[PDB]
Design a protein around this ligand. Structure first.
Ligand SMILES: O=C(O)C[C@H](NC(=O)c1ncnc2[nH]ccc12)c1ccc(Cl)cc1
Length: 167
């Protein structure tokens, strides 16, 4: 039993809800919130910009130190950093950006990072400003993640389409 509330159950292990991931994190304080990161951990916009703003830029400060030490992530890769005021940990996951021409097959590799954590709050990877079809992202999620994932879909219109078309 966990504190996630109001989710629709898509599968044994995948759940979905129309919610702002920022507001959801402040309420649940999950062990792991997933960020829709880029390889540079530059959290300028999208989900990443929203999460970072909610941390008063502390996420960005920590991220800049991480990059200065370790260099950029790989597309499809991830790192665990602090969750600041939003969660215990933030799993920064880099899905491919279609608006950068990156291979959508890398989306499955990106979701595989979720399997290292028993429970996560997460967005649909590669959706939004990353350019991928969110219906495809939800499918890859369900077919790749085996741990318990609570998806927040910010757009109510997108949420209803994801649910109504979910196979
Ligand atoms: O679920 C959605 O609609 C799409 C989602 N976007 C957000 O979560 C979002 N975007 C902008 N401002 C925001 N403020 C609070 C949340 C939020 C998204 C998913 C993957 C990527 Cl790669 C990029 C964006």
């Amino acid at each position: 039993v966990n504190s996630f509330s109001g989710y629709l159950k898509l599968t044994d292990n995948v759940y979905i809800k129309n919610a702002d991931i920022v507001e959801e994190a402040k309420k649940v304080k999950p062990t792991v919130v997933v960020n829709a990161a880029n390889v540079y951990l530059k959290h300028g916009g999208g989900v990443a910009g929203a999460l970072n703003k909610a941390t008063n830029n502390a996420m960005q400060v920590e991220s800049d130190d991480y990059i200065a030490t370790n260099g950029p992530l790989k597309v499809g890769g991830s790192c665990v950093l602090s969750g600041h005021n939003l969660a215990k940990h933030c799993l920064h996951v880099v899905g491919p950006n279609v608006n950068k021409g990156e291979d959508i097959q890398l989306l499955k590799s990106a979701y595989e990072n979720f399997n290292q954590h028993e429970v996560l709050l997460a967005p649909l990877l590669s959706a939004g400003i990353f350019g991928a079809d969110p219906i495809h992202s939800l499918r890859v999620c369900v077919d790749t993640v085996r741990t318990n994932v609570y998806l927040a879909v910010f757009d109510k219109n997108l949420y209803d389409k994801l649910v109504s078309s979910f196979l």
